[PDB]
Write a protein that binds this ligand. Structure first.
Ligand SMILES: [K+]
Ligand SMILES: [K+]
Ligand SMILES: [K+]
Ligand SMILES: [K+]
Ligand SMILES: [K+]
Ligand SMILES: [K+]
Lengths: 466, 467, 466, 468
């Protein structure tokens, strides 16, 4: 059952509606890419949960007392203190958002292994249970190839597994041995594997992975956008921690990484914000190296592109986002949507933490991956009810930066991303109802093809036809 | 069907849960009166929709640019403009809230007819399709007796009627005759009869009523807390206006009153605010008389107890509260709750605008009105699921200020007041689920009796014990 | 010297200017009463410091997390806790503002002595070192005569005295003897005598006064609008407390009253808010009696006309308003204005806590009190520079509710009320410069007379001619 | 009245703390003699910079409350775009979190453009500006592009007055382009109010001439607009042909002489966070879509580019509020007041500019060689004395030659007392002046500085030094 909101709605933002005819015109005008649609032409925007959710009174209140100092802001220290208490990390660098931190640590870490272990940029490879679109982008832009070492169950939308976000431990080890440990600049642990469908990573898996990393002295970066939801799943599924608090599980979790890069725009519940933090003194050097690069890419390292109030707000969000009643509610809503879709015959990845992932591949078997079936489905859904979603399949995966050919994709998923505390059960029902029509028209949905394709992170602004 | 929210949630306030054992202790410490329970001991607070609902971004934004001047604030003029454009009234006096405006116009209007037509304070009577508790309170405190002239269908929870909030025209006229037109200081038209169950008043009824008032030259005050919902019902039920906008219907509606007193804390959607406005120059005198009394009771008449930002916020709320998609949604949610309760066998007044009114009388037939069955039901509901509600029956009606005996009551209703844009469909379902248990235990609920009773507006702070 | 602001300006509200011709037209349209002028027609609004000052970030932040519950709001408890820790009072009832609390306790206290000691309403008299216009108003409206028992030095603008707000102890005692202790419903101690010119009341004086009250068992109500400034003066002038903190002095001060009525719109620094609190159990009865009357006049006693956020904000203001650096600055600014005026030959009451009181009587000796010289001066000042002020003389004092004749007035003062943290030293200089012209035209300022006079609190909306 | 009275009422304040001399003594040492490393709470009056540290208006704070946090196509984006179209007349808008956010985008894009279109030679490319900001110069050099500031002879003569010291050296610009070869000049940056020159204005005539030269060689012109409003004000007070124009009109005119604008909204637009990268018209549509592609990588989707919805609504309002004439007159008059006060006590400064008083450390501390950063020494002295924090705009900031590796020659050693907008009062100005009385009295005893830790890029922000 969809749990009742453990909160009262305090502030609302009105939204309008549109006609089918209008959407038809609009979706064409947008080159068949929802990313290019106007906000006001969307009734229920499930494009992403990043910076689109609601905030709590405490957070809005925090936003009112920021120290806008350019250097040494007390708001910075407030944020730093929250990081020290929650993750146990001593060094903090705020960034405006996720890719803000990535564009800093990646270059820094690469140069490090180069200068220390003779890493060869022409043969370097980074690993992750699964890289973010932007993490992969910045890695490749820095001449580093990536390899996602996910488990066999990860993308089997027909089978259930407790931690589909887990690292393929053997795979990771053989991968490192092959590539050569000196050529692996870092390993990124994505807490709640986004591409796997917001699937959790067990604490045991993290310990094992970190153990392998320690062995080859490879820096481990914990991508923490949805650390809270991951902590929740660990608490519900990993026996050892059934009776631990989200805070305790989080603290434990972060003992298995050397630093964290986070897009606070998710679980921390803020409309803007990111973090780049190092656990301890052993990484003091990368810390000061990141402060140097931060000045260039984001701003002085005591605000790094965030206004004072934004840091006070984040200092609070990191806590509010860990509330157990909240997490149970949020995740239960997603479960509700997934079960609703599954009951009308729309197969999905098992319910994850932030969104329902519809298996476009299974729903539209006639359109080849090369033709982006999940993107076609997205346009169909929008047409139908004014709901906007994103594809997590071949369109997003991109082409091989070396071959120039379309990368093979493990699954063509349509992601119905649910912004935190933004929509109600009625909206969920509305979405499910919409899919009844989408399904009833599956067989007639046409594949898509480029008319304009950017060279980097193409899915955000590309346009397609047919 | 419960319509999907025509808005996105932007800011939330976390709430806490409790155990049955805890509530059991708490309801006792509160003297069996939910009004005395702590907010944090309530999961879903349906005590009232007054100042407890959500606001829109525009409103929260307006709150940020107020002119805190003590006199002639531009924020005051902003509010005045909204009133002129929406209601067509030229004179505006802000008050912190509803009873703030009542404590001003009532004394003023009474003195007026006294000096003008020789009204006899010892024999004066005021009329209304149905007085709010505070309106009745201030009237009686001023030595004026009240008489609610509602229609026969008003309190028949078993029959459906389009406008149960309507004035009993024949009754109003008869009443004015029996009492003597010189002794009737004013008539209050309560837009959406609260006690009737948030039932609407037709525009035709208002015209007729105002016509009668004009005949005897009796001032007509439009109590406007829920004017928007009333405008909505008119639009859905009164043929002549099916195609009018809420704004147009409102403008039309207010041509049939001489002034308005409003608790902005409802449809205007603000956590604080009230209004006392006069339509035109013919009432300029009561206007300046109200400015004089306002200085004493509320504050300088250009802010009357409201901070600058509060007036800017209200200037916006008056508009946002009239949005058609919004009104349809809000009222549809209430309908959903009422239908849900009715489906599990809990008879209610037909769905009104702001709340579901459960008929405690029908649900608990073994308890005499003198023992406040709706209050007993309220305590039962709280114990069961941590939901807080109010009774609109004998407990609230009070005693006859002259006889000193309990006033006879037309219905014992438990009001599940729904704050605007605060709870979801899931909460509604939660409430319905709770009532399944309440119903199952109906026959065992005891009646209540006083242990402490205030002399005025007793229901707010009184304490009772059972049986 | 004007101290430098111990704070940074964070939010500003733009204001406009006007022409002399325009003001001349406006002042007449307003019936020669500044109270009737539009805010936008005023450059520097010194009408009052009540609810017109600035707030701190913490306060604005508090306003964002209020519990709007109709009953038992946690915001109410927050306010109650602040009252308990600052004043040591156990019972709290919020009111929207000052006169909101007055209209409650006055009726309640009167009925009390009537039912307990046989008070005779037809012969009852209340005392105060000096009643506020609204306190006097509500008293008289309730059929109670008032008597201000101020000291001989109080209104001598030519002589300096440490505590001109003090009670005339002998006077108070004789007064009570004359009237009969059974007919005195209450004594109001106005912390910082407003009419005396924002002059302080010593702690010793309060002890003595409370001692007299205890003797006749007369309830003592501490009017606390400017309790903080009074605490400051005590700290600077009363030897015994030179080394005490504002918080400590306040706590001590409130041991000499049975309850407090406060317009939080002043020292607490909020744009809206008031308080009615009782010290302890011995007054539990008046407390529950006030809860009953509050439901009628203000709202449920757990919010009493204040929104949730307003109570959270006040809970913070009560503290922020007691900051020592702040108080020193605020009071130093007033001192600066007073010294500046005195330097150009404009005699004033010695610098008090919230405003400079110009002695209109001494500045315009040709105008008889009956003609309100301070009001004439106010209109002159406005015409000259667009500065708005209020008179604290015969116009405000009113007529004898019994005789119907104009009450005799101890001083005709023009009050240049300074809103807290709103204007700068440059504005002060601007005000002083304006007075150079006002003085240079003193001899030609005409007296005033009614054209419209309300029956109660006339000065707020009356209109005059000539 | 020289210090004009505030054309506004203070609505919200933030309390600040004081410290003891002994404490500052310890603190300045712990900070490696670099104020940038001091804690905010250890500063009474923070004149480090006016960037994102000033106050906002009610309208702005109100705007912050109604943002559309959509990830794409936010209506708040369109609101910002509309303001840009009305004010600057530019049709294409891309929001960025701040200044360097826009720089890291257009610089790479413009360079690749001339490379692919005119055969630019990265190994011989040079960019020009009346004067590059530290971050603009940084990103240029990081992209392998050398910079050349073509300022006028009067620019850094703190002893002489001149109406537009921020002007381009037209002959110099032309000679420079000829020397380097027009195909190797990727762009020209016009810094509206030359920051390094001392917040000195650039005349509209100078801009027309400069743009004319650029059009001739088909060189893209980027208008760095952080302080466009103050520049518009000076033009209105000093350039005869515009004495009677409004700030809005002068701004509109001004922007006809650039192809695009890069702006750190954290200054004149008055916001604590925000930036803009906009193109004038269709002729630059290509760089526009190229910037959208690079923005996705560096900042975020191009319809918010690192700014939350409310931040864009706030900026849409700030761009307007910042152009108010009474406001500008007041703000600039305050700076004039501080400059005249300092000059009164014998402390020579650059003639009053728009956002700060620039003390000439070189003239105040003649015994210290530029190599030893006299302006930085002066900054530490000022802090010790009264808890006032400032920045140096001299050799320390200028850096080393990325090619030679040697310290770059500097035209002036200035200590910048940056005044955040609507934050401090006249009393604070007087406080600052009073502080300098002591600083001056001790001038002869201030020692020079030297590195103990120096970053390879933008060193002045986090470097640490010690007394030589
Ligand atoms: K956002
Ligand atoms: K960046
Ligand atoms: K409220
Ligand atoms: K106010
Ligand atoms: K009242
Ligand atoms: K900032």
């Amino acid at each position: 059952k969809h749990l009742p909101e453990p909160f009262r709605i305090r502030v609302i933002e009105p939204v309008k509606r549109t006609t089918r005819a209008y959407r038809e015109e609009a979706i064409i005008k947008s080159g068949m890419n929802p990313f290019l649609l106007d906000s006001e032409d969307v009734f229920i925007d499930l494009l992403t949960d990043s910076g689109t959710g609601a905030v709590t009174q405490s957070m809005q209140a925090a936003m009112m007392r920021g120290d806008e100092a350019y250097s040494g802001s007390r708001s910075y220290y407030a944020l730093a203190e929250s990081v020290k208490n929650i993750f146990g990390y001593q060094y903090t660098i705020p960034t405006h958002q996720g890719r803000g931190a990535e564009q800093i640590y990646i270059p820094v870490l690469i140069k490090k292994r180069e200068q220390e272990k003779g890493l060869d940029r022409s043969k370097m490879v980074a690993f992750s249970n699964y890289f973010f679109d932007t993490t992969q982008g910045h890695s490749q832009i820095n001449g580093c190839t990536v390899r996602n070492v996910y488990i066999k169950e990860a993308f089997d939308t027909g089978v259930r597994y407790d931690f589909k976000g887990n690292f393929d431990l053997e795979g990771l080890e053989r991968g490192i041995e092959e590539v050569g440990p000196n050529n692996v600049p870092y390993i990124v642990a994505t807490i709640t594997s986004n591409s796997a469908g917001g699937q959790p990573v067990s604490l045991a898996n993290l310990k094992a992975m970190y153990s392998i990393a320690k062995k080859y002295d490879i820096p481990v970066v914990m991508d923490s956008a949805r650390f809270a939801e991951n902590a929740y799943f660990i608490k519900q599924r990993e026996a050892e921690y059934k009776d631990w608090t989200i805070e305790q599980i989080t603290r434990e979790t972060y003992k298995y990484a050397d630093m964290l890069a986070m897009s606070a725009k998710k679980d921390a519940m803020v409309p803007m914000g990111g973090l780049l933090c190092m656990k301890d003194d052993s990484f003091f050097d990368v810390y000061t190296e990141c402060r140097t690069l931060c000045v260039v890419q984001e701003g002085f390292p005591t605000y790094g592109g965030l206004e004072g109030g934004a840091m006070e707000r984040l200092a609070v969000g990191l806590y509010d986002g860990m509330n157990l009643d909240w997490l149970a509610y949020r995740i239960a809503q997603v479960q509700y949507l997934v079960d609703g879709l599954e009951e009308i015959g729309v197969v999905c990845q098992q319910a994850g933490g932030h969104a329902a992932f519809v298996d476009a591949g299974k729903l539209l078997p006639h359109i080849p991956a090369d033709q982006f079936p999940a993107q076609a489905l997205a346009c169909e859904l929008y047409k139908v009810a004014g709901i906007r979603a994103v594809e997590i399949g071949s369109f997003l995966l991109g082409r091989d930066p070396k071959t120039g050919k379309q990368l093979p994709c493990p699954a063509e998923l349509l992601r119905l991303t649910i912004p935190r505390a933004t929509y109600t059960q009625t909206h969920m029902d509305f979405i499910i109802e919409a899919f009844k029509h989408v399904k009833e028209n599956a067989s007639n949905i046409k594949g898509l093809t480029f008319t304009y394709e950017p060279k980097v992170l193409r899915h955000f602004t590309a346009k397609l036809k047919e």
